[PDB]
Design a protein around this nucleic acid. Structure first.
Ligand SMILES: Nc1nc2c(ncn2COCCOP(=O)(O)OP(=O)(O)OP(=O)(O)O)c(=O)[nH]1
Ligand SMILES: [Mg+2]
Ligand SMILES: [Mg+2]
Ligand SMILES: [Mg+2]
Ligand SMILES: [Mg+2]
Lengths: 265, 1064
DNA sequence: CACCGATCCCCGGGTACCGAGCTCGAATTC
DNA sequence: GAATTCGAGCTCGGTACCCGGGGATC
């Protein structure tokens, strides 16, 4: 059909609808970098870099032909290509088609909507079909390589880890990992710690023996993880870089990630 | 000797030597800054080349021409001068009180002394003879008067009948406001010493109604003697019994004229048969000024004794033959005009510059004022001479040098040499200037109402009007030039001379004196009142002539007198059927609409009857119109009962406009353009008759007549719309009325629907007819409608025929006239606001829409959808070229070369900047930034160029110092500054306003939804964003690879693969 | 002292909601 | 006793007027 065709009917739209379900308007004024391997939705929250990979396996049919494409999600700067995938924006949706049609520097994406009716047919709400144009020059700086050590957390665990973190330039935090798993997030007037094994007292992680002490400058790390309203997941550290980075990736059906820049040792 | 002491400097032996120190060649290298000052005792000297002579010594030689006969009493004419004078063009009429005790020695006849016995007012007719002689005829007689109602004054001030300056008589006039009004008995109260009436009209018994107490003595002279004009040939006549003109003796000369007479109105005749204009002289001067203070990059200020005039260009044309006769250059200090400039002058046939050198500023200005008195140019011009040049010079001459200017005009003393500026008077619409017997036609004001430019600087006007690329000297480069030797002062002298030559070229392209003089002849006002005192005195004087003939009198109302509100209901503007109309759109419109209503329906003050008793003895429909105006029933009796006065008034002016238009088809294109502007000026004087009725707290208003004019206008517009819709609704009825419609039936379904209208026009969207002979049939359509509906002077006429029209909004539309030109009507391409960049790109866009087919097809296709349906599906592929222009402008606005003259917005100051209530305007910001920097502060109706400078930390803190998103009135620099300091422009603003102009015009393509248009126009633009500086660095430190611009597609795809696995 | 009219569109600045978000902690739910 | 919609409660832009002013058009 369309030279790039990305089809999300229902029974996969409920997966993606669950991904945007964590209760966010946040990732609306974003940028979608579509291409092979899927759509990547990158946005900046408080100054931090948030990502949502959407693999090609997460659409009913994904076909992409040509160079990577970048769309502002904000269609016409009021509506948004992703406002469709909110929880209850459009109650009765059944299918969404994301067709890109054009020639590499100047492409356009169309997004169609189809809302449910009775007796097996679908109303195309043509008042609300959206058409956006590829950005046609851009650069985004995406996270790279592999983690050296990742630690998986849970919802209350990550909530208390965020609670430990500071408020202002008064309070730098510190994600020290000692020898044998004593992963710990402290500040002057707060400390949290836990053990990492590869009943209730077992977080999981990988390559935990690689001790470190990264140190966080920015208070925003708390705020970001609540804006996203993240429910816990992997906490991956990158230390083979001049400026170390911690990514934090929600462990649910979706992959919304947020990378924060750590100061050295 | 002289009976009237001469108040111009004929002699000086001591004055105030101000002069720069950089003129002093033998003086140490740093004893150069500042100026000299302080008294010096020597007669003021002028150095012309090698020679020198005193400025005020007329004698044998002379460095500038002289047309004066007297000079401080000595009679410098060749002996035996006694020219006979039989015909004498008159260009200005002065009036001045003259006391018979002052003229004991003037040796008049009896019949002038008895006309001034304590005092009289004397009407001086200034002029030329066919032989170049400056005449001055003094018309004795001619006393002002007003009327007061006999009974009203008799009861309000018991009457049973020095005290003889107020001679009175019982006349039988009738008031001009109503048809029911009866001729009462009035007293005609002859004032002399006219000023005294100004007290006795505001102050003597203010509960009586004075009738014509505002009518000056000149108007009594012009009107009381039928035929007389304020500008035209005259002739001395034998007189009532035989009384003759009494040629004065040179000591009794009141003006600087060659010959003078003492006539009365019976010794003068109008002398038609001469039409041509005599040998009158035109001065076209231009001063150049230096600032001599601590900051000599400040703009000169006349009050500061060290901010001095340095140069005065002065060209001396002949007004009739248009020949530049003299090129004078006054110069403080040595001035050697460049040989390149001298040779360009000699090449063009122009006289050689006579550069006059002076030591002191006083000597220069005294020599200029001595030239102005000696040469005595009847007409002066220049560019902005009323806001800068004459105010600078007179400020110098009166504050700094204490020179009386009352004698430097055409009278030898006690004359007016005043300049007036708007200066928060809140009624003055212009800055005036009145030198007596000298007609100052500032070409600035002549050009601002003859051409639409954003900037009216003389370089911009020279390029736009003469197509003459002049080079401008900034007032900032005059210190640096003047400080160097005489050659650089000569370079300044070149730029001064070239300024005045350009202004002479403008004057002789437009010839304002001729057009203005036609208006002054027809109105009854002198030519200086024509230049300056508005439209109401024209109408009032013409109406006063009519009234006084018909036996009426015009009551005085302002004696009983000292936003955006309206006095009555104006005109109907039908709702446009907005859109791109690719079918023919015939524009009918009434010719001289409101004048034709005033004549057709006989509207006046004298024909209105507010009460139905005055017409209780006249038939309805046959003898009087009856109209509900403002909810009030009004009866306007028809002619054959009483002719309107506004009708005959309008006859004269409509004949003038029609004769000017009857010379357009037979003229060159560049002179047809001037003729178009002249007939538009007479159109304005015709519509000001209507406007004069409806001016509240104006001279002689009647908002009943004004509201009737507009009321009948609205009924005529609707009557025309219903006639077109009813009669020609089907094509067969069009074919029955005009059989030539058979060969105009285009294939489609016919219709003829008015799609817009305005005060008079109606835009008939003729579907199914071809545009070819639609104007040929439109003349017949219009004649048919004018015959079926309206009374004879009313005349609907097919004005245009658009093959394409973009009815944007009510007073906005664009359209290409048939087979022909583009007509742009109020869509911001024709507006003085914008910057040349946006105007240029918007014009490119409308040319695409209209001229480029395949964008007109795409645009006409845009209307098959409601606007919002275009938001989803792509615009038809013809609009692609329409977006290339926008894209190009986006590109072209960011590219860093950007001479910022393309980005200069303007706005007119238009009132004292403290008279604003909303004081946060961009041009007001720049006005105060200019006054802060000692720059050239604009004047109340100037246009204030400004750029919108980029939001930078520096500008922000500067604004808070003089005191998120700053307003565009705080990012409001002026372009000279923003070039000097390379502050960079607000690209965000300028592109948002480019799209704003595109959106305002082309929302008509998208069902007039500005938002849908805005969205669809920003779709063309290539969006780009980069992770900002100081951020991509630290992200690149973290091994973040880039995906996008700076890499091959395989690297971007691959590193996204890596990122998707990492970020997973 | 000075002096044509009205209509009308756009745009900038200024105000007032208004709701749509999120957030915050405090009860309600395992 | 750890979690947790819920409901005030705020902020942050729209969106709607709305008034002055520029400056058109009749
Ligand atoms: N007081 C006043 N009223 C004016 C003014 N301008 C318009 N009107 C109103 O217009 C009436 C008819 O419009 P036009 O002048 O185009 O048509 P016209 O006068 O009938 O002349 P033509 O239609 O023949 O060009 C004006 O300056 N002052
Ligand atoms: Mg000049
Ligand atoms: Mg000037
Ligand atoms: Mg007309
Ligand atoms: Mg008209």
């Amino acid at each position: 059909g369309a030279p790039c065709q990305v089809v999300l009917q229902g029974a996969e739209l409920n997966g993606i609808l669950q991904a945007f379900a964590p209760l966010r308007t946040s990732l609306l004024d974003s940028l979608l970098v579509m291409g092979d391997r899927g759509i990547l939705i990158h946005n900046t929250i408080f100054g931090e870099q948030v990502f949502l990979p959407l693999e090609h396996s997460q659409f009913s049919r994904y076909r992409w032909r040509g160079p990577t494409a970048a769309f502002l999600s904000l269609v016409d700067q009021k509506r948004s290509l992703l406002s469709v995938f909110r929880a209850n924006q459009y109650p009765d949706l059944r299918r969404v088609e994301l067709a890109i049609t054009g020639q590499a520097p100047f492409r356009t994406l169309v997004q169609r909507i189809w809302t449910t009716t009775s007796d097996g047919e679908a109303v195309e709400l043509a008042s609300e079909t959206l058409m956006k144009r590829e950005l046609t020059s851009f650069v985004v700086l995406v996270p790279q390589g592999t983690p050296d050590v990742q630690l998986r957390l849970t919802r209350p665990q990550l909530t208390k880890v965020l609670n430990a973190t500071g408020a202002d330039s008064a309070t730098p935090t510190t994600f020290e990992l000692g020898v044998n798993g004593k992963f710990s997030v402290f500040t002057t007037s707060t400390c949290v710690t836990f053990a990492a094994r590869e009943n209730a007292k077992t977080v999981y992680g990988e390559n935990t023996h690689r001790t470190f002490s990264v140190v966080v400058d920015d208070c925003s790390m708390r705020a970001v993880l609540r804006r996203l309203q993240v429910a816990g997941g992997t906490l991956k550290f990158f230390l083979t870089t001049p400026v170390p980075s911690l990514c934090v990736t929600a462990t649910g059906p979706n992959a919304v990630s947020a990378v924060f820049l750590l100061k050295p040792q | 000797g002289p009976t009237q002491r001469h108040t111009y400097y004929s002699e000086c032996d001591e004055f105030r030597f101000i002069a720069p120190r950089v003129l002093d060649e033998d003086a140490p290298p740093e004893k150069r800054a500042g100026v000299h000052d302080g008294h010096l005792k020597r007669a003021p000297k002028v150095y012309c080349g090698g020679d020198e002579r005193d400025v005020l010594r007329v004698g044998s030689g002379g460095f500038w021409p002289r047309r004066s006969r007297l000079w401080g009493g000595v009679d410098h004419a060749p002996a035996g001068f006694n020219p006979t004078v039989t015909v004498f063009h008159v260009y200005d009429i002065l009036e001045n009180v003259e006391h018979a005790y002052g003229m004991r020695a003037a040796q008049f006849h009896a019949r002038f002394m008895d006309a001034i016995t304590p005092t009289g007012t004397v009407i001086t007719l200034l002029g030329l003879t066919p032989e170049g002689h400056r005449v001055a005829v003094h018309v004795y007689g001619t006393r002002q008067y007003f009327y007061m109602n006999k009974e009203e004054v008799d009861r309000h001030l018991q009457c049973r009948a020095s005290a003889d300056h107020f001679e009175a008589e019982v006349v039988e006039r009738t008031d001009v406001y109503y048809y029911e009004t009866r001729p009462a008995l009035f007293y005609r109260v002859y004032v002399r010493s006219g000023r005294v009436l100004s007290y006795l009209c505001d102050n003597f018994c203010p509960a009586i109604k004075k009738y014509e107490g505002g009518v000056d003595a000149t108007t009594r002279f012009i009107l009381d003697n039928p035929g007389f004009v304020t500008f035209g040939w005259y002739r001395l006549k034998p007189g009532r019994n035989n009384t003759l003109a009494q040629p004065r003796a040179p000591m009794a000369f009141g003006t600087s004229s060659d010959v003078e007479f003492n006539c009365t109105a019976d010794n003068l005749a109008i002398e038609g048969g001469m039409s041509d204009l005599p040998a009158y002289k035109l001065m076209c001067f231009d001063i150049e000024c230096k600032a001599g203070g601590e900051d000599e990059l400040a703009f000169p200020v006349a009050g500061h004794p060290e901010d001095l005039v340095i140069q005065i260009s002065c060209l001396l044309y002949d007004l009739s033959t248009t020949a530049l006769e003299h090129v004078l250059l006054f110069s403080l200090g040595s001035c050697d005009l460049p040989e390149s400039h001298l040779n360009e002058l000699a090449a063009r046939g122009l006289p050689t510059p006579v550069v006059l050198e002076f030591d002191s500023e006083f000597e220069m200005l005294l020599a200029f004022m001595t030239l102005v008195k000696q040469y005595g140019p009847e007409f002066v011009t220049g560019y902005n001479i009323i806001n800068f040049d004459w105010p600078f010079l007179l400020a110098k001459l009166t504050d700094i040098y204490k020179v009386p200017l009352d004698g430097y005009g055409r009278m030898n003393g006690r004359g007016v040499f005043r300049v007036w500026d708007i200066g928060q008077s809140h009624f003055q619409k212009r800055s005036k200037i009145k030198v007596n017997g000298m007609v100052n036609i500032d070409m600035y004001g002549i050009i601002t109402d003859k051409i639409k430019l954003s900037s009216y600087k003389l370089n911009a006007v020279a390029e736009a009007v003469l197509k003459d690329k002049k080079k401008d000297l900034s007032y900032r480069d005059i210190p640096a030039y003047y400080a160097t030797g005489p050659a650089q002062r000569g370079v300044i002298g070149e730029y001064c001379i070239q300024d005045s030559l350009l202004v002479g070229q403008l004057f002789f392209k437009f010839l304002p004196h001729l057009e203005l003089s036609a208006v002054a002849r027809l109105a009854g006002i002198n030519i200086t009142r024509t230049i300056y005192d508005g439209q109401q005195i024209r109408v009032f004087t013409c109406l006063l002539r009519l009234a006084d003939q018909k036996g009426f009198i015009l009551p005085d109302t302002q004696g009983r007198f000292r936003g955006r509100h309206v006095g009555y209901q104006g005109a109907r503007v039908l709702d446009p059927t907005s859109g791109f109309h690719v079918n023919p759109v015939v524009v009918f419109d009434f010719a001289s609409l409101y004048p034709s209503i005033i004549q057709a329906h006989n509207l006046c003050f004298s024909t209105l009857s507010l009460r139905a008793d005055a017409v209780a003895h006249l038939e309805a429909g046959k003898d009087y119109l009856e109209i509900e105006v403002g909810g009030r029933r009004l009866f306007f009796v028809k002619a054959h009962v009483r002719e309107s006065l506004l009708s005959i008034l309008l006859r004269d002016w409509l004949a003038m406009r029609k004769q000017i238009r009857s010379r357009i088809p037979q003229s060159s294109p560049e002179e047809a353009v001037l003729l178009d502007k002249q007939q538009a000026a007479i159109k304005v004087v015709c519509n000001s008759v209507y406007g004069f009725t409806g001016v509240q707290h104006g001279l002689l208003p009647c908002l009943h007549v004004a509201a009737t004019v507009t009321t009948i206008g609205r009924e005529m517009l609707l009557a025309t719309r219903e006639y077109v819709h009813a009669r020609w609704a089907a094509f067969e009825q069009l074919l029955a009325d005009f059989p030539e419609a058979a060969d105009m039936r285009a294939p489609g379904p016919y219709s003829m629907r008015i799609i817009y209208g305005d005060t008079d026009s109606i835009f008939v969207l003729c579907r199914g007819l071809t545009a070819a002979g639609l104007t040929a049939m439109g003349d017949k359509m219009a004649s048919h409608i004018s015959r079926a509906l309206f009374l004879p002077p009313i005349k609907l006429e097919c004005e245009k025929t658009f093959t394409k029209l973009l009815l944007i909004a009510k007073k906005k539309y664009i359209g290409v006239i048939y087979g022909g030109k583009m007509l742009i009507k109020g869509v911001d391409l024709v507006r003085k606001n914008n910057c040349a960049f946006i105007n240029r790109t918007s014009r490119a866009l409308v040319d695409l829409l209209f001229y480029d087919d395949t964008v007109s097809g795409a645009a006409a296709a845009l209307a098959e959808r409601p606007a919002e349906e275009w938001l989803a599906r792509p615009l038809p592929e013809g609009l692609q070229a329409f977006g290339a222009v926008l894209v190009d402008a986006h590109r072209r606005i960011t590219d860093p070369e950007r001479d910022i003259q393309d980005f200069v917005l303007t706005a007119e100051l238009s009132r004292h900047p403290r008279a604003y209530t909303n004081k946060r305007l961009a041009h007001l910001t720049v006005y105060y930034k200019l006054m802060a920097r000692r720059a050239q502060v604009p004047s109340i109706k100037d246009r204030i160029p400004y750029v919108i400078v980029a939001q930078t930390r520096e500008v922000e803190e500067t604004v808070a110092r003089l005191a998120r998103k700053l307003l565009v009135s705080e990012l409001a620099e002026d372009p000279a500054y923003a070039i000097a300091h390379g502050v960079a422009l607000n690209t965000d603003y300028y592109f948002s306003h480019l799209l704003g102009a595109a959106c305002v015009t082309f929302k008509a393509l998208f069902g007039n939804n500005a938002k849908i248009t805005e969205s669809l126009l920003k779709r063309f633009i290539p969006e780009v964003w980069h992770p900002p500086d100081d951020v991509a660095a630290r992200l690149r430190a973290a091994g973040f690879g880039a995906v996008g611009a700076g890499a091959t597609a395989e690297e971007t795809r691959r590193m996204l693969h890596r990122a998707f696995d990492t970020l997973a």
